[PDB]
Amino acid sequence: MYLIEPKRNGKWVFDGAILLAIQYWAIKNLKLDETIVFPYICDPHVQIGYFQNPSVEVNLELLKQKNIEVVRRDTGGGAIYLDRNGVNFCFSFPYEKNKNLLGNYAQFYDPVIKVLQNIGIKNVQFSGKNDLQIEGKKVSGAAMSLVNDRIYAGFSLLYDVDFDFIGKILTPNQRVTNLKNKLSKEYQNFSIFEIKDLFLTEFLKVNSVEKFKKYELTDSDWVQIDKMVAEKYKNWDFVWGLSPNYSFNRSIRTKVGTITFSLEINEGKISKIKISGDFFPKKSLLELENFLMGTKLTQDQLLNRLKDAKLEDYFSQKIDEEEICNLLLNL
Template structure:
């Protein structure tokens, strides 16, 4: 098995979009003679499924305030929040084995290693989880791509319960009514279960220790690895530009949906009714009890085709004499209302 890590010019990269681009490049373009493991740690990110609506799944105010990145993956499934407290393990394996669909076997090495590190009660349960004392410490997924098993799991060394609750759009959260206490009852961190000698490890040191146990060696440097070349990085950079760091991919692939926002501003009540497709406004209606001289249909027309993101909306509204249509109001007030 080859080890591949997100290292470029000697520097470890903690960007979750880069990690995803590397996985996809390796899966589609590299044909090594053995299985591949790609472990990574990343800054906070929300990863949504291929068919999910980014606008409806995510609490964007919370994401922005907490510097959380959004990335859309190429496969289906639901929303996943990852941050610096997790070790993420991606595996690309030959499809000619009996692992595909067998999560118990998929998890066997992880269970063995975690028990050896002190997590005595860890077990695989349900369809694709690892639990300790009935609380989830890992979730797994796998799919078949071009005859290869593409899968992985996350090991929760530390858990940010607040972010797990707040990063999802409130009316879509399965556990909204119970909040953080509910998350604490369902999810836990591995750290508190580790043997004393391992409890103060950083997430990177824990990753390295885990890999050394997996490869049965004493030093991370002793593991056989594939170093990404400049040719590889050129293709990875292309994927980042075209997809994983591209607004049109992350937001623009959202399906058609209706968008209603209203609030009481200094000028009176303002309501925006928008239809959005591929992240862009296709229809717009503005209602309210404000006093203006102009017909807001002019603004409605100007909004058609605009991407539903702060910069684009500000650019359009700041170019309009809003006082003529609404009274004294700033473009930023209207944008904040639309994106609220």
């Protein structure tokens, strides 16, 4: 198991966008045939999933007011708020050695639950979706995707929360707790760097690993990471361009999550379409949106096109194609 701390010439980095960039850089460029761990503690910012639209997920005025960034990550899932009171861990798992991990939140979280138990946390449970919950209240969210031969997976930990701010800055569908007061009393006043440390030590134990193999980002890695920051994580086209607000917007709750269709209509046909939501598609939806372009907004064309798109190739659960058809027929 490798550990990549987000350090630059020995300085700890807290920029959420750079932190993802580090991870994705590793994913793409670090051919280590071992799990790499990426602990990260970020300055306040909102991180949204790849398929999400920041405009509908964030209170944009509160974000501007508080002068904090939106950062889109590469994985699906939903929008989280991240500050110095959260400790997150991403991973680059060799896909061949963890073939059953893709989409398997339970497996992914098993060592985490184990770590949290070991650390005195009451009754942390896998939510069954992609979360960890104590007595109804979410303490962690997770996301993953397959990229190259690597599974990119990450979970957050809400060590301490600003409950007021979190429910104000995130506008989903328009509840969570801290871990601080829930650890063994020995740990209850640990700072965030101490929790990260405690968690990583515990994570090694729970995973039967004596020590992390050391990987320090070199100047040269940083040049590539900085480039991915410029071209992607802090690139408007990626953060904002990716999810345009088209004229018509409809959403359905489905098993995979809330799917929103944002589309343009010219001559009774879908002219532009953007499918967004907090889900975890099997492959990129760009192909599906492209497939749907040109479809007449009639039952017959929509049903057929939606059938032909083989939605199961794109989403894990079954989507009601007719639900989507009928939703779109109303425009």
